[PDB]
Design an enzyme around this catalytic site. Structure first.
Site, PDB file in Angstrom:
ATOM      1  N   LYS A  62       0.824  -1.203   0.000  1.00 12.71           N
ATOM      2  CA  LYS A  62       0.000   0.000   0.000  1.00 12.71           C
ATOM      3  C   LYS A  62       0.858   1.253   0.000  1.00 12.71           C
ATOM      4  O   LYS A  62       0.453   2.282  -0.554  1.00 12.71           O
ATOM      5  CB  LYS A  62      -0.929   0.007   1.209  1.00 12.71           C
ATOM      6  CG  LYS A  62      -2.103  -0.930   1.077  1.00 12.71           C
ATOM      7  CD  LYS A  62      -2.842  -1.063   2.395  1.00 12.71           C
ATOM      8  CE  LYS A  62      -3.476  -2.445   2.516  1.00 12.71           C
ATOM      9  NZ  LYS A  62      -4.749  -2.482   1.740  1.00 12.71           N
ATOM     10  N   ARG A 136     -10.604  19.332  23.010  1.00 10.61           N
ATOM     11  CA  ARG A 136      -9.571  19.247  24.042  1.00 10.61           C
ATOM     12  C   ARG A 136      -9.529  20.584  24.758  1.00 10.61           C
ATOM     13  O   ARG A 136      -9.959  21.608  24.226  1.00 10.61           O
ATOM     14  CB  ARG A 136      -8.207  18.863  23.477  1.00 10.61           C
ATOM     15  CG  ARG A 136      -8.193  17.535  22.762  1.00 10.61           C
ATOM     16  CD  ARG A 136      -6.836  17.224  22.143  1.00 10.61           C
ATOM     17  NE  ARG A 136      -5.804  16.913  23.137  1.00 10.61           N
ATOM     18  CZ  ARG A 136      -5.656  15.712  23.712  1.00 10.61           C
ATOM     19  NH1 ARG A 136      -6.477  14.717  23.397  1.00 10.61           N
ATOM     20  NH2 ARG A 136      -4.694  15.522  24.603  1.00 10.61           N
ATOM     21  N   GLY A 176      -7.596  15.927  26.578  1.00  2.58           N
ATOM     22  CA  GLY A 176      -8.936  15.485  26.216  1.00  2.58           C
ATOM     23  C   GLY A 176      -9.854  15.361  27.415  1.00  2.58           C
ATOM     24  O   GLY A 176     -11.076  15.471  27.293  1.00  2.58           O
ATOM     25  N   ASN A 258       1.180   1.796  27.678  1.00  3.48           N
ATOM     26  CA  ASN A 258       0.791   0.777  28.652  1.00  3.48           C
ATOM     27  C   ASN A 258       0.712  -0.586  28.003  1.00  3.48           C
ATOM     28  O   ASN A 258       1.122  -1.590  28.597  1.00  3.48           O
ATOM     29  CB  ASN A 258      -0.568   1.099  29.274  1.00  3.48           C
ATOM     30  CG  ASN A 258      -0.503   2.210  30.260  1.00  3.48           C
ATOM     31  OD1 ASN A 258       0.557   2.535  30.797  1.00  3.48           O
ATOM     32  ND2 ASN A 258      -1.640   2.843  30.485  1.00  3.48           N
TER      33      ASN A 258
HETATM   34  C1  LIG Z   1      -7.744   4.704  26.508  1.00  6.79           C
HETATM   35  C2  LIG Z   1      -6.858   3.947  27.468  1.00  6.79           C
HETATM   36  C3  LIG Z   1      -6.239   4.570  28.477  1.00  6.79           C
HETATM   37  N1  LIG Z   1      -5.421   3.884  29.353  1.00  6.79           N
HETATM   38  C4  LIG Z   1      -4.750   4.611  30.454  1.00  6.79           C
HETATM   39  C5  LIG Z   1      -3.553   5.415  29.876  1.00  6.79           C
HETATM   40  C6  LIG Z   1      -4.178   6.787  29.665  1.00  6.79           C
HETATM   41  O1  LIG Z   1      -3.172   7.822  29.586  1.00  6.79           O
HETATM   42  C7  LIG Z   1      -5.052   6.885  30.909  1.00  6.79           C
HETATM   43  C8  LIG Z   1      -6.122   7.973  30.823  1.00  6.79           C
HETATM   44  O2  LIG Z   1      -6.989   7.738  29.718  1.00  6.79           O
HETATM   45  P1  LIG Z   1      -7.415   8.979  28.762  1.00  6.79           P
HETATM   46  O3  LIG Z   1      -8.069  10.059  29.577  1.00  6.79           O
HETATM   47  S1  LIG Z   1      -8.664   8.280  27.489  1.00  6.79           S
HETATM   48  O4  LIG Z   1      -6.090   9.398  27.910  1.00  6.79           O
HETATM   49  P2  LIG Z   1      -4.937  10.549  27.954  1.00  6.79           P
HETATM   50  O5  LIG Z   1      -4.950  11.438  29.174  1.00  6.79           O
HETATM   51  O6  LIG Z   1      -3.622   9.774  27.762  1.00  6.79           O
HETATM   52  O7  LIG Z   1      -5.157  11.441  26.654  1.00  6.79           O
HETATM   53  P3  LIG Z   1      -6.421  12.409  26.491  1.00  6.79           P
HETATM   54  O8  LIG Z   1      -7.468  12.204  27.561  1.00  6.79           O
HETATM   55  O9  LIG Z   1      -5.881  13.821  26.561  1.00  6.79           O
HETATM   56  O10 LIG Z   1      -7.001  12.091  25.131  1.00  6.79           O
HETATM   57  O11 LIG Z   1      -5.639   5.549  31.056  1.00  6.79           O
HETATM   58  C9  LIG Z   1      -5.212   2.516  29.221  1.00  6.79           C
HETATM   59  O12 LIG Z   1      -4.476   1.946  30.006  1.00  6.79           O
HETATM   60  N2  LIG Z   1      -5.850   1.796  28.240  1.00  6.79           N
HETATM   61  C10 LIG Z   1      -6.644   2.544  27.297  1.00  6.79           C
HETATM   62  O13 LIG Z   1      -7.150   1.936  26.378  1.00  6.79           O
HETATM   63 CA   LIG Z   2      -7.042  12.076  29.822  1.00  9.67          CA
END
Ligand SMILES: Cc1cn([C@H]2C[C@H](O)[C@@H](CO[P@](=O)(S)OP(=O)(O)OP(=O)(O)O)O2)c(=O)[nH]c1=O
Ligand SMILES: [Ca+2]
Ligand code: NA
Ligand code: NA
Ligand code: NA
Ligand code: NA
EC number: 2.7.7.7
Length: 310
Positions: A62, A136, A176, A258
DNA sequence: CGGCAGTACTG
DNA sequence: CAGTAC
DNA sequence: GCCG
């Protein structure tokens, strides 16, 4: 990114597979896209492409079409349902199965969802905040939100430790949502405080809706006071001090970071969660007072939060 | 062939 | 349990 | 989708 003319096309397919429920194909795309964003120079040869981890024959094929053509023909055959499925699954609480069900039932717009769809409690809150939850916030607002939770928590026990995690801790300019981790070095005091803390934040008007209200994690919706404020997603997690390092690691992310660390841990006969780093098999919980200890027990060098932004 | 991270919460 | 989310 |  040396390969935006490549990844921009691939991300459209990745999203298409994702909203249609093809979880694993979408993951493969997601990984190839980051592998591509992490090569120094533009991809020039098919054999240059396979060189990258995460890029196989199908993907290299691709990338060559993209370079010889400037385009990827598979983009021309993406189903007309995909934009609607994306619209529906951007409702918090509605995923691919709900989106596909609503599409099969004839729904095509959020007006159709508002007026005719059966919504769960969570999905009704997601729909009411549809625009806001796609936006955001500047990290300065995340700071005000973290401080609002910390002040309410420290009012009932000044020993409580409160740390904003997620993208905020990784140093991003925008967030976010806000992820607040709460514990107490006494190993005891953290217990049973939600009913008080949330009542306090709710009694303020700060907490506007609840999405998830578990024994250890709260997911909901808040809004700071005054004009010009939007509703923001807020997650609060309360953990024992014994688990603080692994909870900090988990909650700081990124998600791909993670998943990568956990996959590594499993290759070594271990298991990594937000509760503990263990030996696998039950297994034995390994002592992890610091994030640095998790990295050391996995045989990896310590990474500060900013370099976990995968 | 088959995993692809591990866990929490909802109804 | 399936679905959804962090 | 990729990879062991
Ligand atoms: C989606 C998801 C997250 N996690 C963890 C790592 C993320 O860092 C944290 C917070 O989750 P979030 O609020 S959705 O993410 P962030 O703050 O990183 O980024 P934004 O909110 O600014 O978009 O939980 C995870 O282990 N498996 C997942 O499948
Ligand atoms: Ca977050
Ligand atoms: Na490869
Ligand atoms: Na959703
Ligand atoms: Na109708
Ligand atoms: Na969050």
């Amino acid at each position: 990114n040396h390969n935006l003319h490549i990844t921009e096309k691939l991300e459209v397919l990745a999203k298409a597979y994702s909203v249609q429920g093809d979880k694993w194909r979408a993951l493969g795309y997601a990984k190839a896209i980051n592998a591509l964003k992490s090569f120094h120079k533009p991809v020039t040869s098919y054999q240059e492409a396979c060189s990258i981890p995460g890029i196989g024959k199908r993907m290299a094929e691709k990338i060559i079409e993209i370079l010889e053509s400037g385009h990827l023909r598979k983009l021309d055959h993406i189903s007309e349902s995909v934009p609607v499925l994306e619209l529906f699954s951007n409702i918090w609480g509605a995923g691919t199965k709900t989106a596909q069900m609503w599409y099969q039932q004839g729904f095509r717009s959020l007006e159709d969802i508002r007026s005719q769809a059966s919504l769960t409690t969570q999905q009704a809150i997601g729909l009411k905040h549809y625009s806001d939850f796609l936006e955001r916030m500047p990290r300065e607002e995340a700071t005000e939100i973290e401080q609002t939770v910390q002040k309410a928590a420290q009012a009932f026990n000044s020993g409580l430790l409160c740390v904003a995690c997620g993208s905020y801790r990784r140093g991003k300019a925008t967030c976010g949502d806000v992820d607040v981790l709460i514990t107490h070095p006494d190993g005891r005091s953290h217990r049973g405080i939600f009913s008080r803390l949330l009542d306090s934040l709710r009694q303020e008007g700060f907490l506007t809706d609840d999405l998830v209200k578990g024994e250890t994690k709260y997911l909901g919706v808040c809004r700071l006071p005054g004009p010009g404020r939007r509703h923001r997603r807020l997650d609060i997690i309360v953990v024992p001090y014994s688990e603080f390092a692994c909870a900090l690691l988990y909650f700081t992310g990124s998600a791909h970071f993670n998943r990568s660390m956990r996959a590594l841990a499993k290759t070594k006969g271990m298991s990594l969660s937000e509760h503990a780093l263990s030996t696998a098999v039950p297994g034995r919980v390994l002592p992890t007072p610091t994030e640095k200890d998790v990295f050391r027990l996995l045989g990896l060098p310590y990474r500060e939060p900013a370099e976990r932004d995968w």
